[PDB]
Design a protein around this ligand. Structure first.
Ligand SMILES: N[C@@H](CCS)C(=O)O
Ligand SMILES: N[C@@H](CCS)C(=O)O
Lengths: 363, 363
């Protein structure tokens, strides 16, 4: 059989070179990087090279931190709860601005903080499926400890006004976090252009393994640890380093940024071919803006067929995609550098056949 | 060259069967287990088999939880901070009983909690290198939210009472956590015999990969999540599952308990050989009780050469060991595994003895 993977915003396939670079640390180089002996120090070059690729990938400076976490969910929790303790409690800045589109690792955590008494503003989405930077300016009070806005939305692919949001936060003296998991390898990410204080990412959205991520922390910015303990990561996040996955995530970041052109010029054109072909189908329409999106994502709605019905039919033909709320659920088809034009043609065909058969059965 | 690995309490080599069982999830079975399509559901049977091995490894019941964490440090932070919120803050039980012997993942987190006002009693170690169950008895007030005592000490290998301590906690209505990281695969671990509410472990001390751990939570016990979000792990710990390491850690756990007889009978005999041989050296003495220890660990002190000097010399000969606090200054912790051999121990006796006599003549 030959299956087609079009659910890359949910997770991605590890790049074969990433598997390759990880293998020696799953085998004979198993020493603890914190060890003073040869098994420990022999890992230091590869870890340093992995860190360098991570820093350069997002334009972090030598004075900034790029802290290894176990996933973007950890990074997001660490930002929100660290700021809750540092600014909301200790400084009386008991207000946070975020959006209604945020990933559950941000929204669900904010719901918890609200239960502790934090005031949380969930900025509403516009008809374009996006947030305006004016919205964050409206919502910032003199009590706002932190603004958290995702760089790109995981369901629609829509890119948010990070640069502007960062300028507004800087002129107002407010800490800025961006959950940038969906942007890595899709668009260039520059923490300096964003004026971000915090930036989250997760390797498995860009062809590294599940269960590692990163938190960028700007120089001089504090954040009470979420993992207290040993002295790992300049004392900011304790726990024995996940050597293999650090090395892999570094390589995944490098390869991601090296393929940025290809992602926009080849993968984006496969996304357009897919979307344009699917819009010749009657009742089919894109949910949200078709401009200011990452190259790999299309979220289409089909007049009477639910998203899950299309997903179940599509899965029977070994094509993997997922749902995305529409505002009844829509179909998110999300591509990568590993898809081919043959697969898009095939998906056009199977998607169309499924559409016509599910309508005929619908009445 | 032939290096000799004797620092297994710091981390271990991944068993080749563990690496083998992980590889397919690093290659073609890269689906997100939360996905409804085929790429996600195809991972379910391996995850269920992995979980089963973990439960059986610690005699957790079907009604209990074994939550997948990113390491023991997460498990410990999660226990201590979740109990701070649920009992110290929400119930006014503003007191915690632990030991001076704990891993920093416990003590340093407790020090943070002391900064928040929690009363923490760090039970002092006795001349035997252990704590008694009577000490926890004496220290329990009606304000005690939690007792946390590690099952086995990572520096001395000394086994703590646990069974009796858990009986005392249950009769007094106090939550009991044991950091059991050093016990897995070293001695049988039975959470029901321990009457543990919480039990922590980390795969890389039992020949699984770094960066994955577990937290046993007894059925019905609550613990406010450390990671809020997507509602993975029955809503208790959010973030995309690290499928390869879960499958690997399950197999590592299975292998550890299947090798318990070998650990006690062969590895234990090798540790005794090493230790007895090193006690023929003058001025040498094991730090602590030499009874009620895990089989694999010996902690030796040498008159006036500190541990670091012996480690540097030993490392030059490609033998890896680590230090340990002794109350000349520091001692040498030698921790074996099922992958060490009698040839290695002989070579190590030779090299250690030569190192001692040479460093003494220079001293
Ligand atoms: N639900 C997310 C992945 C994190 S669970 C998405 O598929 O876009
Ligand atoms: N507990 C470790 C130190 C880093 S986790 C050890 O004893 O070698």
């Amino acid at each position: 059989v030959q299956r087609i993977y079009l659910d890359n915003n949910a997770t991605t396939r590890i790049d074969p070179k990433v598997k390759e670079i990880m293998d020696p640390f799953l085998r004979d180089h198993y020493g603890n990087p914190s060890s003073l002996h040869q098994f420990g120090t022999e890992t230091h070059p590869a870890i340093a090279e992995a860190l360098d690729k991570l820093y350069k990938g997002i334009n972090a400076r030598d004075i900034d931190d790029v802290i290894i976490t176990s996933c973007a969910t950890e990074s997001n929790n660490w930002v929100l709860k660290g700021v809750y303790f540092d600014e909301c409690l200790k400084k009386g800045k008991n207000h946070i601005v975020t959006t209604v589109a945020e990933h559950p690792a941000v929204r669900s955590t904010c719901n918890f903080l609200e239960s502790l008494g934090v005031e949380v503003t969930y900025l509403p989405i516009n008809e374009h499926g996006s947030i305006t930077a004016e919205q964050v300016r409206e919502a910032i009070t003199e009590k706002t400890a932190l603004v958290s806005v995702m760089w790109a939305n995981n369901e629609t692919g829509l890119i948010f006004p990070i640069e502007e949001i960062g300028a507004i936060c800087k002129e107002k003296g407010v800490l800025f976090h961006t959950d940038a998991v969906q942007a890595i390898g899709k668009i260039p990410v520059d923490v300096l252009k964003a004026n971000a204080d915090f930036l989250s990412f997760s390797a498995h959205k860009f062809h590294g393994p599940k269960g590692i991520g990163g938190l960028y922390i700007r120089s001089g910015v504090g954040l009470t640890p979420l993992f207290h303990g040993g002295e790992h990561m300049n004392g900011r996040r304790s726990g024995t380093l996940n050597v293999p996955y650090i090395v892999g995530m570094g390589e995944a970041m490098k390869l991601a940024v090296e393929h940025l052109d290809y992602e926009k010029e080849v993968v984006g054109k496969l996304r357009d071919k897919l979307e344009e072909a699917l819009l010749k189908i009657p009742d089919v329409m894109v949910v949200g803006d078709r401009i200011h999106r990452v190259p790999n994502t299309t979220l289409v709605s089909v007049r009477g067929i639910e998203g899950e019905a299309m997903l179940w039919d599509l899965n029977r033909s070994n094509i993997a995609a997922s749902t995305g709320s529409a505002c009844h659920t829509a179909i998110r088809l999300s591509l990568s550098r590993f898809n081919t034009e043959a697969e898009i043609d095939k998906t056009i065909e199977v998607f169309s056949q499924a559409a016509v058969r599910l309508r005929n059965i619908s009445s």
